[PDB]
């Protein structure tokens, strides 16, 4: 510490961290101090834009991120991770072990339609095929289209949280081609 305080020794550093400078007089996020975080009036969607993407997102995108965190909240205790959290909480553990034992089921079958239903539609939209050929392409291989289908809410009976999101993306949100492809 004395030889590096007066700067006569050089050490290569690990852990390159392009996120959250904790040193100094203020907590800096991506490049923005915490007083600017609360002064520019960005919510949890704004700080997800800062911590996850290192970018100051526009005010509709932060509100859409908050809306997605509000609909991807609880979906009842029957589902797989909520079940594991309850089995863990009834074994008397603690909050972190219960949350963690339920979080370690978000994989491919439970909770992995978010990423797969975007990779699939992006690999279909950027390959340059019309939707009527994409459905039949996914009809000759097995492998159902991820992100399509509900067991109850169908049509003339919409899902009403797909609808709040969908009328958010139609109104506050310019130039949305992959959602138009998914709606086709």
Partner 1 sequence: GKSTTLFSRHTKAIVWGMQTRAVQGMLDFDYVCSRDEPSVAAMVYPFTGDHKQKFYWGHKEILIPVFKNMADAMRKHPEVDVLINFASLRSAYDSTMETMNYAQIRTIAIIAEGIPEALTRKLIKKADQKGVTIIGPATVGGIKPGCFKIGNTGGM
Q: Does 171 participate in binding a second copy (rule CB under 8 A)?
A: no
Q: Backbone dihedral region of 20: left (phi > 0), alpha (psi from -120 to 50 degrees) or beta?
A: left
Binding flags for a second copy, 59-88, as an x/- string (CB under 8 A): -------xx-xxx-xxxxxxxxx-xx-xxx
Nearest to 178 by CA among 108, 117, 135: 117
Q: Which does 107 bind (CB under 5 to 8 A by kind): a second copy, ligand COA, partner 1, none?
A: a second copy
Three-class SS of residue 16? coil
Q: What is the DSSP string of 9-62?
A: ----------S---SSSS-B-SSSBHHHHHHTT--HHHHHHHHHSSS---HHHH
Q: Does 17 participate in binding a second copy (rule CB under 8 A)?
A: yes
Among the residue ranges 4-12, 82-90, 115-123, 155-163, the one whose residues contact partner 1 (CB under 8 A): 4-12
Cα four-point dihedral sign 113, 176, 66, 53: positive
Q: Does 173 participate in binding a second copy (rule CB under 8 A)?
A: no
Q: Does 148 participate in binding ligand COA (rule CB under 6 A)?
A: yes
Q: Which is nearer to partner 1, 13 or 96 (CB)?
A: 13
Neighbouring CB atoms inside 10 A of 85's CB total 21
CB of 14 to partner 1, least distance (A): 9
| Number of residues located near ligand COA, criterion CB under 6 A | 5
Q: Give the footprint of partner 1 on this chain (CB under 8 A).
A: 7, 10, 12-13, 16, 142-144
């Amino acid at each position: 510490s004395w030889a590096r305080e007066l700067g006569l020794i050089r050490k290569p550093a690990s852990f390159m961290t392009s996120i959250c400078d904790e040193r100094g007089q203020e907590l800096i996020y991506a490049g923005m101090p915490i007083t600017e975080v609360f002064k520019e009036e960005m919510g949890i969607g704004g700080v997800l834009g800062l911590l996850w993407f290192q970018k100051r997102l526009p005010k509709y995108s932060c509100q859409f991120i908050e809306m997605c965190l509000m609909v991807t909240a609880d979906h009842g205790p029957a589902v797989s991770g909520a079940h594991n959290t309850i089995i863990c909480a009834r074994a008397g553990k603690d909050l972190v072990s219960s949350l963690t034992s339920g979080l370690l089921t978000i994989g491919d079958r439970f909770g992995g339609a978010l990423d797969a239903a975007a990779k699939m539609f992006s690999k279909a939209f950027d390959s340059g095929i019309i939707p009527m050929e994409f459905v039949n392409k996914m009809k000759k291989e097995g492998k159902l289209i991820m992100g399509i289908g509900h067991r109850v809410k169908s049509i003339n009976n919409p899902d009403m949280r797909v609808q709040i999101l969908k009328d958010y993306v139609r109104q506050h949100f310019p130039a949305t081609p992959l959602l138009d492809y998914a709606l086709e």
